[PDB]
C-alpha cells in the first residue's frame, strides 16, 4: 500500500494548496498602488577592495557595520575595513575551494567551509583555526552564527546542522530537504531560520525542537539565494529561473514575484535594506538589481563589476552595501 | 587625539604586511596551474598521472602536485561528494584544463560517460574551459574486442557502418578505438565558439607519458587562448 500513501500525500498537498488559495484575499502588488513608489535609485562605487587572487565566493558584514569578511577561491579569508579599505586580517585557508564564510555577532570568530566538508572556526581575538567541525557528507554552502557557542551550517548532503563550537558535535540535524541546500538566513529573533535547497522547496526550521515548521514551494528552479525580512515575518528567495519570490511565514504562501523578461540570467544573492523597502539581488548579467519590495519594479542597477556577482551584503543599519563578484573585486555602494 | 592617528597608522602597517604577504603568495598562485579531474568509478582517474610529485588526500578532495619542465600542476579530484554535481562544478570555472577519464572498455556505462561529457562540455560557465579526454584501460578494451564475446553493435549501431578514419596512426581494435574517439569528438564539436577544444589521447593504466601529454595539451590550450585574445585564431 505504498501508492495509497502516495495519494495520501497528494491529497494533503491539495488540501494545503486550497487552504493557501482560500486565505489569498488579494495580491500585495495591487494593494501597494496607493503609496508612492521609490522611483529611481542611483548608487556610486565608494571603495574598491582589491587584493583577492581568485574569484570571491562569499561575504558577510559584521554587527559593527565596519568590518566585512570575504572568502576567495584561492584559499584566503580577508577582513576589510569598509571605512579605510585597509586589510585587518588575511587567514590562509587549508582548502582552496571555499564556498562560504561567516562573521560572528561578537566579532571574535569567523567561519569558513567549502568542498572539504569541514567547517573551520578561526579566532580573531587570540590567528589559527579554533575548531574543525567534521561529519558532513557534502560541501559547505552557507554558514551563519547564532551565538559564540552554536553555529548553523548548510551542507550539500540535503541536510543542515546546528553544531556546538566547544563540543564539536552535531547538536541538531535537519534532514528535510531533497536537494542540495544552497543558503540560509537567520531571523532577527534568532529562534527560526529559513533554508532554500536545490529543489523547488524552502523550509523553515526551529533551533529548539529541531524540525521543519513550514514549507514553501513557489519557486521552480534551484533556490540559490535567500534572506529574511528585517521584521522576521517574511523572507525573499532567488532561483536560476530569473525570478525572486517573497514568502511570508504567517501567510505560508507567495506574496510577490520580482522578474523581468529582459532578465534571463540566474540569481546568486538576495538581501533586504534597513527598512526592507528595497531588495538588492545580484544576477548573472554581471550586475545587481534593486527591486521595490512593495511595487516589484527595478529601481536601480549596480553594474560596476565585470563578472557574475557571487555575494551581496547589507549592514545592520543599511549605511552601505557590498557586492563581491568572481572578478576578485568587491564594490561598495551607497 | 594621538591615539586615533596611532591606531590608524598601525592599521596601515598591518595592511602593508598583509599586502606583502598577498604579493608573495601571488607568485606561487600564478606558478601553479589548477586542473580539474573527473570520471566515473570504473575510470582510473586516481592513478592517471605517474609523475606525481606529491599526492595528498584531504577530507574530501585528492590533491596531486607535480612539476613538468619546471612548470607546476595542481590537479584536484572531487570524489567525496554526492551524485548531484551541477552546483560545485561552477567552482572549477577557473581551472586551466579538465581531464575527464573514460573507461573505454565497458560499453553499457559508456553512454553514461558520453552524457557526462556532453553535460560538462555544454555548461554555461565551463564553456571557456576545455576538457581533455583520456581513454584509459585500452588493454581491457583490446582484449574484449579480440575475444569477440561482447560486440559494440549491441550498444552502438553506428559502428556497423563506421570505419576507421583516413588519418589514423596506430584492425578491429583501432576501429573501435577511433570510433569511441570520433563519438566523443562529435559531442565535443557539437558546441563551442572556438573558445575551447577537446584533446583526445589514448593512454593505458601502465603508461607513464600522461604527464607529458597533459603538459603539451595545457600549453596548446593557453597558446590558443592567447591567440584568440590577439585575434590570431
Amino acid at each position: 500500500e505504498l501508492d495509497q500513501l502516495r495519494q495520501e500525500a497528494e491529497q494533503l498537498k491539495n488540501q494545503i494548496r486550497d487552504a493557501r488559495k482560500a486565505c489569498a484575499d488579494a495580491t500585495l502588488s495591487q494593494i501597494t498602488n496607493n503609496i508612492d513608489p521609490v522611483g529611481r535609485i542611483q548608487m556610486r562605487t565608494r571603495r574598491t577592495l582589491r587584493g583577492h587572487l581568485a574569484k570571491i565566493y562569499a561575504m558577510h558584514w559584521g554587527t559593527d557595520s565596519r568590518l566585512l569578511v570575504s572568502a576567495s577561491q584561492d584559499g584566503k579569508l580577508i577582513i576589510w575595513d569598509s571605512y579605510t579599505t585597509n586589510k585587518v586580517h588575511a587567514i590562509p585557508l587549508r582548502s582552496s575551494w571555499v564556498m562560504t564564510c561567516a562573521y560572528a555577532p561578537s566579532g571574535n570568530y569567523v567561519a569558513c567551509g567549502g568542498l572539504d566538508n569541514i567547517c573551520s572556526i578561526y579566532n580573531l581575538k587570540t590567528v589559527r583555526v579554533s575548531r574543525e567541525l567534521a561529519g558532513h557528507t557534502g560541501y559547505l554552502s552557507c554558514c551563519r552564527f547564532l551565538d559564540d557557542n552554536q553555529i548553523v551550517t548548510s551542507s550539500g548532503d540535503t541536510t543542515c546542522a546546528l553544531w556546538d563550537i566547544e563540543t564539536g558535535q552535531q547538536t541538531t540535524t535537519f534532514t528535510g530537504h531533497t536537494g542540495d541546500v544552497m543558503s540560509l538566513s537567520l531571523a532577527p529573533d534568532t529562534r527560526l531560520f529559513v533554508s532554500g535547497a536545490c529543489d523547488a522547496s524552502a523550509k523553515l526550521w526551529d533551533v529548539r525542537e529541531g524540525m521543519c515548521r513550514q514549507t514553501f514551494t513557489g519557486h521552480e528552479s534551484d533556490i540559490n539565494a535567500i534572506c529574511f525580512f528585517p521584521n522576521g515575518n517574511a523572507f525573499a528567495t532567488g532561483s536560476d529561473d530569473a525570478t525572486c519570490r517573497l514568502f511570508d511565514l504567517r501567510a505560508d504562501q507567495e506574496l510577490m514575484t520580482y522578474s523581468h523578461d529582459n532578465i534571463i540570467c540566474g540569481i546568486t544573492s538576495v538581501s533586504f535594506s534597513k527598512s526592507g523597502r528595497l531588495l538588492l539581488a545580484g544576477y548573472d548579467d554581471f550586475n545587481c538589481n534593486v527591486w521595490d519590495a512593495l511595487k516589484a519594479d527595478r529601481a536601480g542597477v549596480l553594474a560596476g563589476h565585470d563578472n557574475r556577482v557571487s555575494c551581496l551584503g547589507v549592514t545592520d543599519d543599511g549605511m552601505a552595501v557590498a557586492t563581491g563578484s568572481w572578478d576578485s573585486f568587491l564594490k561598495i555602494w551607497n | 587625539t594621538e591615539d586615533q592617528r596611532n591606531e590608524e597608522k598601525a592599521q596601515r602597517e598591518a595592511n602593508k604586511m598583509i599586502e606583502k604577504q598577498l604579493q608573495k603568495d601571488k607568485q606561487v598562485y600564478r606558478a601553479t596551474h589548477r586542473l580539474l579531474l573527473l570520471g566515473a568509478d570504473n575510470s582510473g582517474k586516481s592513478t592517471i598521472v605517474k609523475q606525481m610529485r606529491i599526492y595528498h588526500v584531504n577530507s574530501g578532495i585528492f590533491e596531486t602536485k607535480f612539476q613538468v619542465d619546471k612548470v607546476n600542476f595542481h590537479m584536484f579530484d572531487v570524489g567525496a561528494q554526492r551524485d548531484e554535481r551541477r552546483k560545485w562544478i561552477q567552482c572549477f570555472n577557473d581551472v586551466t584544463a579538465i581531464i575527464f577519464v573514460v573507461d573505454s572498455s565497458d560499453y553499457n556505462r559508456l553512454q553514461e560517460a558520453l552524457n557526462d561529457f556532453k553535460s560538462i562540455w555544454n555548461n554555461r560557465w565551463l564553456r571557456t574551459i576545455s576538457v581533455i579526454l583520456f581513454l584509459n584501460k585500452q588493454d581491457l578494451l583490446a582484449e574484449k574486442v579480440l575475444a569477440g564475446k561482447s560486440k559494440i553493435e549491441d550498444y552502438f549501431p553506428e559502428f556497423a557502418r563506421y570505419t576507421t578514419p583516413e588519418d589514423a596512426t596506430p584492425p578491429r581494435v583501432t576501429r573501435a578505438k577511433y570510433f569511441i574517439r570520433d563519438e566523443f569528438l562529435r559531442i565535443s564539436t557539437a558546441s563551442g565558439d572556438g573558445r575551447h577544444y577537446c584533446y583526445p589521447h589514448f593512454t593505458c593504466s601502465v603508461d607513464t607519458e600522461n604527464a607529458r601529454r597533459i603538459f603539451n595539451d595545457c600549453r596548446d590550450i593557453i597558446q590558443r587562448m592567447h591567440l584568440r585574445q590577439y585575434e590570431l585564431l
Partner: nanobody
Amino acid sequence: QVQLQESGGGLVQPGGSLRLSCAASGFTFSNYKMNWVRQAPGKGLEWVSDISQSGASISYTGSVKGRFTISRDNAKNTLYLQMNSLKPEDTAVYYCARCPAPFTRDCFDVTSTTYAYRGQGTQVTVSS
C-alpha cells in the same frame, strides 16, 4: 509547485507499440529542456532520449536510436514518448527529467539517484 505526473504503462507484449505521456505543472514548460530516464530492477538509471525547448534538437541513445520517438506540446504542457520494437530486456520504470536551468543545454543531474525535478515514474513490463 513543480509536479510531473506520468500516465500509461502497465504490461505490454514485446514487439508492439506503447505511448507514455507526462503532464507538468507549477512552472513554464516551454522554457525547460526535457529528458527521459529508465531504471531496471537491480540496475542504475539509464538515459534514453532528450528534447529541447522548441524541439530543435532531439537526441537518443544508441540502444533505442530510431525505434523510440519523443515529442512535446508547449500549448498543453505535455510530453509524449512513443515506444516500439520492445524487447524483453528493455523493461524498466521510466521517469521524466527537467532541466535545472531554463533554456540551457547542460543537463547534469537528470540521471541522479535523488533528483527533485522528476516524476515518480510508471512501471513498464515486457514479456511473452
